[PDB]
């Protein structure tokens, strides 16, 4: 007996066929377009989409005046509007099935740092997040796959201790000032 929880969960699935061209090609295009590191970051966002399609595909067999479909189905669309993947006029339960991987990958903090212009490339956003230069509303966020909600998109900035926004220079500029 222990006071520990052993409840864990894997967050990706690997494909059934390992060496398949045009699966390899499409995921490499999605790695290069969004600045991701390995295939497992695509297989992770493929997995949260496959959980959302599957739960909506279950809710589509119950009729329109079901209790469970009306409650749990309105709570599924609410999250997808909240993270900015769906829009507001498309809140029937059948524009869930028209979602794709790219809608979910456009909402990462990495691509949003690139979209707002705080970076100048999609790989420049990965480092600027990871070097702790990026904060969201007060809080330095150190994770590039931080899915930016819709209300937290207007507050993404440059982290008041950083040499980019705050002003105290880094390791390199101060040593060159010492050698001045």
């Amino acid at each position: 007996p222990v006071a520990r929880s052993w409840v864990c969960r894997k967050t990706y699935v690997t494909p059934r066929r390992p060496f398949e061209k045009s699966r390899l090609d499409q995921e490499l295009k999605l790695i290069g377009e969004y600045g991701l590191r390995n295939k497992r970051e695509v297989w992770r966002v493929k997995f949260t989409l496959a959980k959302i399609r599957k739960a909506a595909r279950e809710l589509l067999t119950l009729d329109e005046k079901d209790p469970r479909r009306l409650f749990e189905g309105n709570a599924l669309l609410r999250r997808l509007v909240r993270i900015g993947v769906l829009d507001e006029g498309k809140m029937k339960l059948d524009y869930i099935l028209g979602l794709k991987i790219e809608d979910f990958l456009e909402r990462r903090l990495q691509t949003q740092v690139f979209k707002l212009g705080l970076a100048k490339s999609i790989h420049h956003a990965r480092v600027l997040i990871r070097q702790r230069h990026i904060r969201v509303r007060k809080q330095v966020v150190n994770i590039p796959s931080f899915i930016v909600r819709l209300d937290s998109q207007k507050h993404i900035d440059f982290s008041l201790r950083s040499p980019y926004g705050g002003g105290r220079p880094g390791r390199v500029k101060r040593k060159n000032a010492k050698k001045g």
């Binding site: 490499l28 295009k29 290069g32 600045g35 991701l36 590191r37 390995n38 790989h123």
Partner: peptide, 14 residues
């Protein structure tokens, strides 16, 4: 890592 995947995306697609 990520710069290797960028290199082999730049070799094949763009």
């Amino acid at each position: 890592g990520r710069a290797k995947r960028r290199m082999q995306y730049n070799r094949r697609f763009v």
